[PDB]
Subunit: 221 residues, 4 copies
């Protein structure tokens, strides 16, 4: 996957209920240090018995079968954007939550001092600014970063607002010291659902913090 | 309806996930002063475009077609226990919230000084204690009360808990100065869902605060 | 419950997607002789491991907890109208099928020769005609009948169609030789769901064939 | 996508409720000659006001926004596998029915005489046999075929059955005269749902019949 063309980017203005994206990145993420799955619905998703403000259970649809089973019996670290509307678990569970990927091993992956990272932002071609974000994981979830990144630009540069966004088009780009570059369109298809958009974290992509970079691009358009 | 029999009272011990009742009466209720429905799904429910922490829309299932259509063009005050698991609205609605009944006119039904009402608590026959609860409405949603009443006992006499309850059988009894008397088992069937239990507030029973009395009967068993 | 008033009746002209009612009574009902529940979802419903063209599982929401348990270990004869839109069973079960009540014991309740019952139809004050319906059960589900009855009038007097109905109002009245009389409105509220209408059979009302009578009242209007 | 490895194939023995696959392929597919979409839920799916025995409406999730929109205003021919458990449409549509892909232009793409295509079957390495399948389309959905192929083997070589499979591993492979080859795993992961599986049809892959070939590999294992 190479750098996107200006004709592939979803434009905010078009998206219907866009606020439903706001809440995703404005509200705190789900975080759980060292845990282990318990039940699982489909051979490609895992469940965890963790609690939170709005949940007493949690599922995470991973890339596929092979991946799911791999973390079935491993103490992991979860960091994901959850969604509620259209989330399923135990035939008997109200107070469910859902996420995709965001799962990374625990032992031998949690650092000493948080390796901050520089996120370069480009508004209309010109590099207006840059900021920092932290992490603990030597190997972090693509997701994690994106959030922390967005969360910021959402509280300081009003990326998403309970309503129209200040930017027409925006995408986040990752640069692993050795792998290919990739990106996520900050905006959904005109008509979307939380569940459907959040599949951008399903591949549960992971990359070394120490060696990866991050570039953001937006259009004041 | 007349006073129950100790064999018709649901017993807490039996109830599975009982906490799902807890969260209902522990967390803040749904309040909305003077509003008017907008769209409506079924001829017996109305929708209100209100806002809350976890919702931007709201549905309320009432007794039937008649009643619904009755409050459609009327400004009203809403006060009700909301559930989330199994709540529907607009095909394009994420962040939904529901409730049963809990609707009362607004104009000419709001007092000056909150009329305080005394509830007589009886633990195992003996009238252990009594407490107060307020309102504003001349004609109150049976619901409202029930809530306020449970909320208290819960935070003070540990009615419901995030887990097993201290009590086994308990029910609230209302007594209208000229109407019959009725009650609501404080405990759902062994296997229930929020949406199903809360239906007790469907008839949207209303009564005059000035003349009506309340009694609660619990069992330490 | 006494005979209705011409203002309490629903009007087929109002009903939106009326066809959804057609099908219900057009297509074959659900029949299963001598069986036993297996699993159960909510304290007040039972699941049967039976099959039909479009289902390998079947749930039946009964009146209350009490009633449910009562048939949990009894060989019964099911006979009822099923619906698929909005039916829940096993977290893993696709091809579900739900119905309300329609459960009657099996042993010592089935006859030799079917007792034909006469239904008196009335179109606009005048008793235009009457026909016969069969059954085997000494004690039958209020349901069973109503179907057989409707079914008929639909293939012969086109009660329901894939669209507008020839009639505007109509209801079926049952007359137990000793109990009270009661009825069902042939037309739902203007905006309904199969699930929500079919509950008229939840009480699982049963009556003796030998002694009961049926009368229908329609309007050409 | 090159030929799979014997470790990448899902094994029926494992698969849970497997029958659910049977049904999809045992009962008639969904066909519609020359039609046009009307409404649409997500920017990447379309809806058609078509009628079948179990549906008065039909949705079809395609590859993405672009594709959908492309076929939005065109007379198309639908050919595809429909699943019901978990199919969504209009907030007011019961009797829904979904499918992925299976959409192809209509005008100029339909033939005179059905070009029969030969499929090569290989049971345990040996090509025990081969058979023919028809079609009208100059360009066919990968789907159509896969179905007809399976449907066949299913009534003649007991591929699937209302239960365990006579085979353990099987996949259909397609071969374009100028494009890359690919395949579909005849079996779902151990725990699946119709919805999820049928997705292998989402890319709405299409290809010229006159030049394409079909192979099938299974194992009696």
């Amino acid at each position: 996957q190479q750098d996107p063309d200006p004709s592939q980017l979803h434009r905010s203005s078009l998206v219907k209920n866009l606020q439903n994206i706001y809440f995703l990145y404005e509200g705190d993420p789900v975080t759980h240090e060292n845990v282990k799955s318990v039940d699982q619905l489909l051979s490609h998703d895992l469940i965890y018995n963790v609690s939170g403000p709005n949940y007493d259970k949690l599922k995470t649809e991973l890339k596929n079968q092979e991946m799911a089973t791999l973390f079935k019996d491993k103490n992991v670290d979860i960091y994901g954007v959850e969604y509620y509307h259209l989330c399923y678990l135990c035939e008997n569970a109200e107070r469910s939550a859902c996420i995709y990927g965001g799962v990374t091993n625990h032992e031998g992956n949690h650092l000493e001092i948080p390796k901050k990272i520089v996120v370069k932002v480009s508004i209309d071609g010109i590099q207006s600014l840059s900021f920092d974000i932290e992490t603990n994981k030597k190997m972090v979830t693509a997701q994690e970063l994106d959030y922390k990144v967005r969360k910021y630009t959402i509280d300081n540069k009003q990326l998403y607002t309970n309503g129209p966004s200040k930017y027409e088009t925006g995408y986040i780009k990752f640069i692993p010291k050795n792998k290919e570059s990739f990106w996520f369109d900050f905006f959904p298809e005109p008509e979307f659902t939380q569940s459907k958009y959040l599949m951008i974290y399903k591949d549960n992509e992971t990359l070394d913090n120490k060696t990866s970079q991050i570039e953001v691009y937006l259009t004041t358009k």
